[PDB]
Design an enzyme around this catalytic site. Structure first.
Site, short mmCIF file in Angstrom:
data_model
loop_
_atom_site.label_atom_id
_atom_site.label_comp_id
_atom_site.label_asym_id
_atom_site.label_seq_id
_atom_site.Cartn_x
_atom_site.Cartn_y
_atom_site.Cartn_z
N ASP A 84 2.05 0.96 -6.42
CA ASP A 84 0.80 1.70 -6.17
C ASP A 84 -0.45 1.22 -6.92
O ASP A 84 -1.49 1.87 -6.87
CB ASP A 84 0.97 3.20 -6.43
N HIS A 140 7.50 -1.27 -5.69
CA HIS A 140 8.56 -0.28 -5.82
C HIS A 140 9.78 -0.90 -6.46
O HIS A 140 10.15 -2.03 -6.14
CB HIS A 140 8.95 0.31 -4.47
N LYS A 190 -2.02 -3.79 -4.86
CA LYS A 190 -1.80 -5.16 -4.44
C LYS A 190 -2.15 -5.39 -2.97
O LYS A 190 -2.76 -6.40 -2.63
CB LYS A 190 -0.33 -5.55 -4.64
N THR A 191 -1.75 -4.45 -2.11
CA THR A 191 -2.01 -4.57 -0.67
C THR A 191 -3.51 -4.38 -0.30
O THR A 191 -4.05 -5.08 0.58
CB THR A 191 -1.12 -3.58 0.12
#
Ligand code: GNP
Ligand code: MG
Ligand code: NH4
Length: 401
Positions: free
Chosen positions: A17, A81, A20-21
């Site tokens: 969270d 994750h 990165k994306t």
């Protein structure tokens, strides 16, 4: 695919969270206002899998392309994750340099450490740090504190922590700005300038690797899928040498024996290539194999250039509980997971006759016996994981069988 600039493989790593994306998406938008060859990628274009929408996290590593004035980049966005470390490793194993994303609000977290550690054991040579979510942190003091912790955390896993560029910014606000004005060039916006600041760091800090295109062909497979009209595609970053359409190649590892096939297509980011060379992130269209006959972890190799092995000696560091490892030691018969590049395989630990037990924080030598053959080589770094936990880091020292 017409190539004009040097090509380099980067990617995004860091704790769940931390952004990165979003940063990846931001990168494509910013780059594309300068270079019109860059195809922008939205948040949902990257976390696109049903199961990613379902669970609200990145699960699969995505490959996006962008470019600066100096270089062409293939960017591999990894999950943070804890349950998808397996995927992070395979992504990292394709990186010539990684961008460690760290949330200014949360500071370094358990997968900040684990990703740095693992990035190393798959040979990531350089890290730039993007301190993200600064738009939520008013106090300069904490921002300095967060940088300080990250720089020291990198020093622990033998990265030049006091030296790596640490760019402070907000991936979300840059990406929001590019959405409001896609033609937003450098200098018009402070957040978008932070992304340029990141891009500049990657350009200059992460060097273009020396790649031997004359050595026997070797491409570790990161993934395999079916193209509906074409066939089976094995993807990955070519480690060395070249592959052209029409070449016989061997599928090595993970099966009882090697099988040969003919390359019937080569593509990089969906643009077909004539030839694939070392460094390129390509899809290799393989003939006479279904997606059940090639898998992640095998390598494509020049026929007979590689012999898969099952037994080796390693120099291993067992993590301390504090580094996220085991709380107690293991004996011979310990059967954890071993990660080499994109390969992930169960192996058996056999200690020397003197050694009855191995404790956390120990440096030790033992021999490992894998349950399937894999492309190994002396000096190849690897990682040990077990019970959803990284427990050790080692390197092959002697190939036995
Ligand atoms: N305030 C703020 N929020 C941000 C920023 N960047 C990302 N976020 C928020 O943080 C959350 C996580 O972002 P995301 O890109 O999904 O992170 P991730 O590191 O890719 N997660 P994962 O480990 O699952 O792949 C989202 O809700 C996103 O909108 C930022 O610069 N500022
Ligand atoms: Mg993500
Ligand atoms: N993804």
């Amino acid at each position: 695919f017409v190539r004009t600039k040097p090509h380099v493989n980067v990617g995004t790593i860091g704790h769940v969270d931390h952004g990165k994306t979003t940063l990846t998406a931001a990168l494509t938008y910013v780059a594309a206002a300068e270079n019109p060859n860059v195809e922008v990628k939205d948040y949902g274009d990257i976390d696109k899998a049903p199961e990613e929408r379902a669970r609200g996290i990145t699960i699969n590593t995505a490959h996006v392309e962008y470019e600066t004035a100096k270089r062409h980049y293939s960017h591999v966005d990894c999950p943070g994750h804890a349950d998808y470390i397996k995927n992070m490793i395979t992504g990292a194993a394709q990186m010539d340099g990684a961008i460690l994303v760290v949330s200014a609000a949360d500071g370094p977290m358990p997968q900040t450490r684990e990703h740095i550690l693992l990035a190393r054991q798959v040979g990531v040579p350089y890290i730039v740090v993007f301190m993200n979510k600064v738009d939520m942190v008013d106090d300069p003091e904490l921002l300095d504190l967060v940088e300080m912790e990250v720089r020291d955390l990198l020093n622990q896993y033998e990265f030049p922590g006091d030296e790596v560029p640490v760019i402070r910014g907000s991936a979300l606000l840059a990406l929001e700005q590019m959405h409001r004005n896609p033609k937003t060039r450098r200098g018009e916006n402070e957040w978008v300038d932070k992304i340029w600041e990141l891009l500049d760091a990657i350009d200059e800090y992460i060097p273009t690797p020396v790649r031997d295109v004359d050595k026997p062909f070797l491409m570790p497979v990161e993934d395999v899928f079916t193209i509906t009209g074409r066939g089976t595609v094995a993807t990955g970053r070519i480690e060395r040498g070249k592959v052209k359409v029409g070449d016989e190649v061997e599928i090595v590892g993970l099966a009882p024996e090697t099988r040969k096939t003919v390359v019937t297509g080569v593509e990089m980011h969906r643009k077909t290539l004539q030839e694939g060379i070392a460094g390129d992130n390509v899809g290799v269209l393989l003939r006479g194999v279904s997606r059940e006959e090639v898998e992640r972890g095998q390598v494509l190799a020049k026929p007979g250039s590689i012999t898969p092995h099952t037994k080796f000696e390693a120099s291993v560091y067992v993590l301390k509980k504090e580094e996220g490892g085991r709380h107690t030691g293991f004996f011979s018969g310990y059967r954890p997971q071993f990660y080499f590049r994109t390969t992930d395989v169960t192996g058996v630990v056999q200690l020397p006759p003197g050694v009855e037990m191995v404790m956390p924080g120990d440096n030790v030598t033992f021999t490992v016996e894998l349950i399937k053959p894999v492309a190994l080589e002396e000096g190849l770094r690897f990682a040990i994981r077990e019970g959803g936990r990284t427990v050790g880091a080692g390197v092959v020292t002697k190939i036995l069988e």
